[PDB]
């Protein structure tokens, strides 16, 4: 936009200080060359040196424009990032907060400033108000609108005691109330992480960046020596070449194109990342994402919508539907997970008889655990359990009970239908199976069709039955899957893949997959996910769609693409710029070299001028390429190398020839030199 | 003539590969610490007697072993040359070298340059040439081959911390690869007219009645090792154009084959040790492409010869000036490109007299870094520096991390390879600027005009790149030139071996990933051409301005 261009230009003027340029050696050499050429210009114009003064003034001026355009690219990128940070910061503002006295719902709440909230406080949010801070929901269930953080007006459910109990500050609740507890301190909230990603002064160079910078420095040393030693050589051959022309040759040969555009490429990379609904704490993970070959998905919440709902209760043999649903409801009362809530809701719509009070039962609640993979209740001399197939089999075996054959047949049928089958057992007799069907989320299967095109494999880690896992696998169109896998097994799979030298990327959501998320090198933490998961994942997705890593890879690739391509371009550019400076700089010492001029430029002065002018303008003409990246297509390694070289390697050879000629012709028509 | 020259290049490369692959297999066995068939019995006692205990060394110990051996080598050769008069086999009662000449010669032969600012038939004695220069030929070749041995080990070994044993490598190399091969080559030279004896100088009463004192000496032994180990240390002023050092064209053919033999074998061994012959073939393919094109350019340039010869009333313009009659212009062009590409230094035709282009390409084959079938060991790890750099820019362009043979190349490796690629050209450019800025450095130019600067540049570039070739018109016997070139050569060799050993040390610790779908195949014409363009662009863009004022200026004049 016009505002951001004038603002970035102002910042580029403000970055001309040497302290700001000390950090980029490529452009620092240009800064010092420009400085000594403007010093030569002022001195020789005053009368302290021989030779033409306006030529040195023009050369030094265009060198100042070179550093200015480099800083302009850097500033424009940072400005376009800073603007996004501004918008998010504006969204961070909260009106007020209301804290309760007791943790139970219905207590007295008082108005307190949102800033005064600290870790451990319990805040209530009714319909209409906004979430004051992040945290986990402890009581109640409702549908909140995360449009303030994701930009999507679609609602999302948020229930307590489950994988969906993660609330983000700034959202707006309108369907019901919720009681949450802020487990984050001021300054560490998820909304501030986006600012940490975008704000400058804390975005260190990535490993690949540093390696490429080493390369540019190496080249700069080479050209510095070449041009610096050109003076004694030509001095022996005759009149020494002017230091002005040597600085021109130096700044031309230096990779100023990529030198100036490197910082801009990094910043643009992180802007594009934020623009793709991905919050990456560091570009290192984004670059590593380009080398990922195996994708680790989560069946529930990542490939599936999540919060599977119970559909029907199926009895096996000698078991009434009433007894089954009653036992399932009683066992689900202690299960705050969405599965238990849905089981209870189904029992309600089926019978809706009686009410439960823990005191009226005098029995402790057995909470659901990922390790036990079963929940239940312990009434008077009665043990009731409910869990997965393998878990229930282990318990019924430990209690001296056997599994009916028809029970297994019904479980196999339900699993073939694609619904996670759960089995409930009262004492030593299996009552029946529960149908816990779920909806697929997103056009996943269609997307993986092209995900696999670029060599990324998809593996769905699943703790459900073999057949239900296989069913969703099919709907998902994933490569392979796992059955009856515990958290340690998910982690073990990443251990196995990471030993073979294959970066593993984990797109997961729940707390169960948190450590596996952390162990993997690259990760995508779905916003429909817990704070422990998010903090442990390098990238946090807001669209909560498992193919966000596709976008990620595209960006990371693009980043590296642009880096390497601009390098190829810059070195190729040097060749043509030699053909412009060599016959011009030694026109007065070795007239024979004038025949070596193939571009057929007008005059030596004008040849060197055209070289410097091109060196400056090709940064502005590549600013959009650096900000948008290289629109690469999904190809193989050898074909992608072929395309990148054919475009940029030959562009860097032919572009400067035609461009130097075009600029020389413009100077020749305008009559400047 | 063009047909003749193409036939010569083709036969040279054909016989070269036919001899390179066998020795490549043997060198591969040595790279994997697997003794040669039938040598295990004697190695057991030799190492037991010497103290070499097959104890693995890390990159620090390995580098220190190589450096210590070379240090002791130059100390011993320095004092041998100084005290040349108090030593046996002195048929000509000549004085020991001066401090500057002794220093430069010692650094020349230890550093595997064999740069010469003397006449070996007047200056050096039979003992210096036998126990001083020949020994350093062997040991310098062995040092370079040990460095590349450890680098190849770093590429093949998985999550290790050692690079083998430097003493075992040096001993095995010099006893079974260099001594018997060089023995075979030396006996062949003797049979074709080379000189191998310890007699005093013979007196000739010529047919037409002039006095001609003929120089003798053990020339065949030093000739086999100077060509095999790419040392280039000539027994006389005329290096490989002397009838005693290179008597027949058959010996010349075998000498060129010997120059390229070990470098090619070390590429074949590189491909065989890594478990993929395609890699070695790739590396050789790239070096062969650049080599053939350079030979073609030089051949055509020298055929174009000198226009003044035809204007002055000769048969043709064929530039015979610094050539021999035994070897034609084409043979001399091929040998020029061979000796300057392989970092041999053996000049069978005075490069000063070559045409501007004819001398340009050899100069530029030294300046690029001696990466085209380069020195014995030197050439392969220089080319591996350039490969790392190419793999970096390649994986960078395709969006994947730099990976070569599954070893990821990261930041630290990048620093090391960058410094290694900068050592040589920095020396060339800085030393040439120092020579062209001092009266003592410019006064050595025999030919005026751009060709004088070409002489200075060629000298410093050959010294910094450890080639040893020289235009031979520049007089470098001065103390300034001796010290400058000695410094340049010392820094070239050792300041390039240090970061290469650091690359090896940093690479052993890493693991190697398998061949995934996205892994850029480094074998094939795509990467071959990428490597060629990398070395050629970096090589051109570094020395175009220097070459512009030297050979190019002389061509366009």
């Amino acid at each position: 936009e016009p505002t951001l261009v004038v603002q970035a230009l102002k910042e580029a003027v403000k970055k001309l200080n040497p302290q700001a340029q000390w950090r980029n050696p490529v452009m620092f050499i240009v800064w010092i060359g420009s400085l000594l050429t403007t010093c030569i210009s002022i001195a020789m114009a005053s009368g302290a040196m021989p030779g033409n003064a306006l030529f040195s003034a023009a050369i030094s001026g265009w060198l100042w424009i070179t550093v200015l355009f480099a800083n302009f690219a850097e500033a424009l990128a940072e400005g376009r990032s800073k603007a996004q940070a501004n918008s998010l910061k504006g969204v961070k503002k909260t009106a007020f907060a209301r804290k309760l006295r007791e943790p139970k719902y219905g207590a007295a709440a008082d108005k307190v400033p949102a800033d005064q909230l600290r870790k451990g406080d319990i805040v209530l949010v009714e319909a209409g108000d906004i979430i004051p801070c992040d945290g986990e929901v402890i009581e109640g269930g409702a549908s909140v609108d995360e449009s303030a953080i994701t930009g999507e007006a679609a609602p999302v459910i948020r229930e307590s005691g489950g994988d969906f109990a993660s609330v983000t500050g700034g959202t707006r609740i309108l369907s019901d109330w919720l009681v949450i507890e802020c487990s984050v301190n001021p300054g560490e909230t998820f909304l501030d992480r986006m600012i940490a990603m975008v704000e400058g002064a804390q975005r260190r160079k990535t490993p690949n960046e540093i390696a490429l910078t080493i390369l540019l420095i190496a080249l700069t040393i080479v050209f510095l020596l070449a041009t610096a030693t050109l003076w004694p050589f030509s001095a022996w051959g005759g009149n020494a070449v002017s230091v002005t022309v040597l600085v021109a040759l130096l700044v031309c040969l230096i990779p100023t194109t990529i030198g100036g555009l490197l910082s801009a490429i990094g910043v643009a990379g992180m802007s594009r990342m934020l623009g793709a609904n991905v919050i990456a704490t560091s570009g290192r993970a984004v670059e590593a994402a380009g080398d990922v070959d195996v994708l680790l998905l989560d069946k529930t919440g990542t490939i599936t919508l999540g919060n599977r709902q119970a559909s029907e209760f199926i009895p096996a043999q000698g078991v009434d539907e009433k007894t089954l649903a009653d036992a399932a409801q009683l066992a689900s009362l202690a299960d705050e997970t969405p599965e238990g809530r849905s089981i209870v809701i189904l029992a309600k719509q089926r019978f809706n008889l009686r009410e439960r009070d823990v005191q009226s039962l005098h029995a402790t609640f057995v909470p659901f655990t990922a390790q036990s993979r079963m929940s239940g209740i312990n009434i008077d001399n009665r043990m009731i359990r409910k869990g997965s197939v393998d878990a229930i089999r282990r318990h019924v075996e430990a209690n001296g009970g056997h599994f009916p054959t028809d029970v297994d047949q019904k479980v196999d049928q339900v699993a073939r239908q694609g619904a996670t089958p759960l089995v409930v057992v009262e004492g030593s007799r299996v009552l029946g199976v529960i149908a816990l069907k779920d909806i697929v989320k997103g056009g996943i299967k269609e997307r993986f069709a092209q995900l696999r095109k670029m060599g990324i494999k998809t593996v769905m880690i699943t703790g459900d039955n073999r057949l239900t896992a296989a069913a969703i696998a099919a709907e998902a169109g994933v490569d392979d899957f796992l059955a009856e896998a515990t958290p340690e097994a998910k982690l073990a799979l990443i251990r196995q893949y990471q030993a073979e030298g294959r970066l593993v990327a984990m797109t997961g959501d729940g707390t169960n997959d948190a450590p596996a998320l952390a162990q993997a090198d690259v990760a995508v933490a779905m916003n429909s996910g817990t704070q422990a998961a998010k903090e442990a994942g390098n990238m946090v997705d807001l669209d909560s769609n498992p193919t966000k890593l596709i976008e990620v890879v595209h960006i990371g690739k693009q980043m590296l693409m642009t880096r390497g391509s601009l390098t190829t371009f810059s070195i190729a550019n040097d060749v043509a710029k030699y053909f412009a400076i060599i016959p011009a700089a030694f026109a007065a010492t070795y007239p024979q070299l004038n025949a070596l001029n193939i571009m057929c430029l007008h005059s030596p002065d004008s040849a060197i001028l055209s070289a410097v002018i091109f060196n400056a303008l090709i940064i502005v003409f590549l600013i959009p390429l650096a900000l948008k990246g290289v629109s690469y297509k999904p190809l193989t390694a050898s074909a992608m190398l072929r395309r990148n070289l054919w475009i940029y390697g030959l562009g860097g050879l032919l572009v400067p020839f035609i461009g130097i000629k075009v600029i020389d012709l413009l100077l020749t028509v305008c009559g400047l030199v | 003539m063009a047909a003749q020259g193409f036939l010569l290049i083709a036969t040279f490369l054909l016989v070269l590969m036919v001899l390179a692959r066998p020795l490549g297999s043997g060198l591969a066995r040595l790279i994997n610490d697997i003794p040669l068939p039938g040598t295990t019995g004697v190695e057991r006692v030799l190492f037991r007697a010497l103290g070499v205990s097959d104890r693995e060394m890390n990159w620090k110990q390995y580098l220190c072993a190589i450096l210590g051996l070379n240090m002791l080598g130059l100390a011993v050769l320095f004092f041998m040359l100084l005290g040349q008069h108090y030593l046996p086999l002195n048929p000509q009662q000549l004085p020991g070298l001066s401090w500057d000449l002794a220093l430069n010669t010692a650094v020349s032969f230890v550093t595997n340059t064999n740069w010469r600012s003397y006449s070996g038939e007047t200056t050096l004695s039979y003992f210096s040439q036998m126990a001083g220069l020949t020994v350093q030929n062997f040991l310098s070749a062995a040092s370079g081959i040990a460095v590349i041995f450890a680098l190849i080990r770093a590429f093949t070994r998985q999550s290790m911390s050692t690079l083998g044993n430097a003493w075992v490598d040096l001993l095995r190399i010099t006893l079974w690869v260099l001594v018997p091969v060089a023995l075979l080559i030396a006996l062949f030279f003797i049979q074709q007219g080379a000189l191998q004896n310890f007699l005093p100088y013979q007196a000739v009463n010529t047919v037409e009645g002039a006095q001609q004192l003929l120089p003798m000496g053990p020339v065949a032994s030093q000739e086999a090792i100077k060509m095999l180990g790419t040392n280039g240390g000539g027994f006389f002023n005329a290096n490989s154009s002397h009838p005693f050092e290179n008597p027949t064209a058959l010996t010349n053919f075998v000498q060129m084959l010997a120059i390229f033999l070990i470098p090619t074998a070390l590429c074949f061994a590189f491909g065989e040790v890594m478990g993929d012959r395609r890699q070695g073939r790739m590396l050789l393919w790239a070096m062969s492409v650049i080599f053939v094109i350079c030979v073609g350019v030089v051949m055509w340039a020298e055929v174009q010869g000198n226009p003044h010869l035809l204007a002055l009333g000769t048969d043709s313009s064929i530039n015979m000036e610094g050539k021999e009659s035994r070897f034609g212009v084409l043979v001399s062009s091929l040998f020029a490109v061979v000796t300057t590409a392989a970092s041999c230094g053996a000049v069978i035709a005075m490069h000063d007299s070559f045409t501007a282009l004819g001398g340009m390409v050899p100069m530029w084959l030294m300046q690029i870094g001696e990466v085209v079938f380069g020195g014995v060991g030197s050439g392969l790890y220089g080319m591996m520096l350039f490969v790392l750099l190419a793999v970096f820019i390649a994986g960078l362009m395709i969006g994947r991390t730099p990976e070569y043979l599954g070893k990821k190349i990261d930041v630290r490796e990048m620093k090391l390879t960058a410094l290694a690629i900068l050592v040589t050209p920095t020396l060339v450019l800085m030393g040439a600027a120092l020579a062209m800025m001092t009266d003592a450095g410019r006064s050595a130019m025999l030919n005026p005009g751009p060709h004088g600067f070409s002489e200075v540049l060629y000298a410093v570039s050959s010294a910094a790149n450890n080639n040893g070739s020289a235009f031979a018109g520049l007089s470098a016997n001065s103390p300034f030139w001796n010290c400058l070139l000695a410094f340049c050569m010392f820094v070239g060799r050792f300041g390039v071996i240090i970061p290469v050993m650091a690359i090896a040390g940093s690479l052993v610790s890493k693991k190697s990933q398998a061949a995934s779908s996205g892994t850029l195949p480094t074998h094939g014409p795509l990467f071959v051409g990428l490597l060629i363009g990398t070395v050629l662009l970096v090589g051109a863009l570094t020395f175009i301005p220097a070459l512009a004022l030297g050979p190019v200026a002389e061509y366009l004049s």
Partner: peptide, 27 residues
């Protein structure tokens, strides 16, 4: 070795040292 060449060589040496230092470092 005039003043012009003295300061020229000095500046080249200084920029070379700066570049080498920046190369060794990860600034």
């Amino acid at each position: 070795m005039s003043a012009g060449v003295i300061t020229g060589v000095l500046l080249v040496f200084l920029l070379l040292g700066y570049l080498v230092y920046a190369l060794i470092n990860a600034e």
